[PDB]
Amino acid sequence: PVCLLCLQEPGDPEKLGEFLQKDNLCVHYFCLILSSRLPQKGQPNLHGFMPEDIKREAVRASKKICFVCKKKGAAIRCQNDQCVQNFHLPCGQERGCLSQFFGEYKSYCRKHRPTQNIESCVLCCENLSRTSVENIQSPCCSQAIYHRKCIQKYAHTSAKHFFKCPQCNNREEFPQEMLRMGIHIPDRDAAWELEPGAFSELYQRYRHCDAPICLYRDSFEDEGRWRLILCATCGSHHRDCSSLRPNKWECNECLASMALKRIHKELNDLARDPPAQCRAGPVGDDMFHWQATIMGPNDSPYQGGVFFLTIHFPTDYPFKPPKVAFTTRIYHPNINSNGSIKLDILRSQWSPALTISKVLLSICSLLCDPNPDDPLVPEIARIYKTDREKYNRIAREWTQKYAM
């Protein structure tokens, strides 16, 4: 099981492309796209390359020899009009060759390669190497020095729709400069969006009849007296069970190793400069599961309350956002009864340069400035928008009854 072009093992799909075993063919995605001859004579429904063109490219590749390993089968040809250096994709990667991922998908040797006129990489929280080949500089703000591997990983994880400058959120000059420097910016969706778990936390709604005497839990009829109706006050708590004509109701209560290193650094920074008086730490010996405490911000209906949160970091932190959820119940339009948080920075607008401290600051701001137009709990959003006094009274009552 080796690539038809580079004659190599699949190894790392992030460095050689997804190894595909379709149509009795076995070829790397990067080897496939970066091949100079391949014309894409087919519709996208292998990524638009027919098997026949792949066979022709392999036959033409056997005609040429690699410049690193003197072995036949090389297909990628330095596109300089004068240079005749052909090679194997892994070879070229090892010896310093660069491959572009825009337009013609043209590669270049070490001699002929795009170059920049050129502390630590903020993404990996490590000292940047002295090899200028594996370091890339922003053209835009910071012009920061970044490890090439870190930028790529940010590119693979955060898709084209979300690949941007970690600081100024540049989406025109920064992606173009990265493309010119041989960074693959695939046109997909973000990795945290693609994973099968997705964000089911945010998409669950309360389905439970709380009456001690029910007319029946699992299944509520869509319509009729056997339908579901939710509390207008909290929304956290059948219609014929409610025993009031269909003709509003209120409930009785209402009447890997890089990730670990980054996490240790962020923990120390949080210890040195806490956002809102927040003390945070790992659960047991698991550094990827934290417990945190937030002292309710002054000038909010939550002032004086101490709210506890759970934080789970993904294995590819900070390239994917951490999962953050409230453990203490709170009356807020963007936090549901299970403690899930509808905060944009935990799903979208994520930048690997963001720290848990910034997340906690964003949560404090959300507590003080909710977003009722994108509500997780529509009833609370409606109360917030229509009757601010009632919202503040109930939030204050809940803070006194729970929280503090």
Here's the x/- map for Zn ion, 95-134, by CB under 5 A: it reads as: --------------x--x--------x-xx----------
- 141 counts as binding Zn ion under rule CB under 5 A: yes
- 69 counts as binding Zn ion under rule CB under 5 A: yes
- Residue from 148, 153, 156, 238 touching Zn ion (CB under 5 A): that is 238
- 278 counts as binding Zn ion under rule CB under 5 A: no
Closer CB to Zn ion, residue 186 or residue 281?
Answer: 186
- 26 counts as binding Zn ion under rule CB under 5 A: no
Breaks (C-N over 2.5 A) in the chain follow: 45, 118, 216, 237, 247, 255
Query: Residue 101 in contact with residue 185, Cβ under 8 Å?
Result: yes
Q: Which helix (H) or strand (E) holds 148?
A: helix 148-157
Please give the C-alpha separations between residue 247 and each of 229, 243, 346, in angstroms, as whole numbers.
13, 12, 41
Q: Which helix (H) or strand (E) holds 20?
A: strand 19-20
Closer CB to Zn ion, residue 121 or residue 381?
Answer: 121
Q: Which helix (H) or strand (E) holds 384?
A: helix 378-386
- 31 counts as binding Zn ion under rule CB under 5 A: yes
- 234 counts as binding Zn ion under rule CB under 5 A: yes
Quick one: residue 103, left, alpha or beta (phi over 0 = left, psi -120 to 50 = alpha)? Answer: left
Closer CB to Zn ion, residue 11 or residue 281?
Answer: 11
Q: Which helix (H) or strand (E) holds 308?
A: strand 306-312
> What's the rounded Cα separation, in Å, for the pair 386 and 380?
10
Smallest gap from Cβ 291 to Zn ion, in A, equals: 28
> What's the rounded Cα separation, in Å, for the pair 4 and 20?
11
Number of C-beta neighbours around residue 232 at 10 A:
15
Applying CB under 5 A, which part among 42-50, 53-61, 163-171, 175-183 lies near Zn ion?
A: 163-171
Smallest gap from Cβ 69 to Zn ion, in A, equals: 3
Smallest gap from Cβ 181 to Zn ion, in A, equals: 15
Q: What are the residues facing 282 on neighbouring strands? A: 290
- Residue from 13, 42, 50, 80 touching Zn ion (CB under 5 A): that is 80
- Residue from 25, 68, 145, 179 touching Zn ion (CB under 5 A): that is 68
Closer CB to Zn ion, residue 171 or residue 289?
Answer: 171
Smallest gap from Cβ 103 to Zn ion, in A, equals: 16
> What's the rounded Cα separation, in Å, for the pair 73 and 87?
8
Residue numbers of the site for Zn ion (CB under 5 A)?
3, 5-6, 28, 31, 66, 68-69, 78, 80, 83, 85, 88, 91, 109, 112, 121, 123-124, 140-141, 147, 150, 165, 167-168, 170, 187, 209, 214, 231, 233-234, 237-238, 241, 251, 254
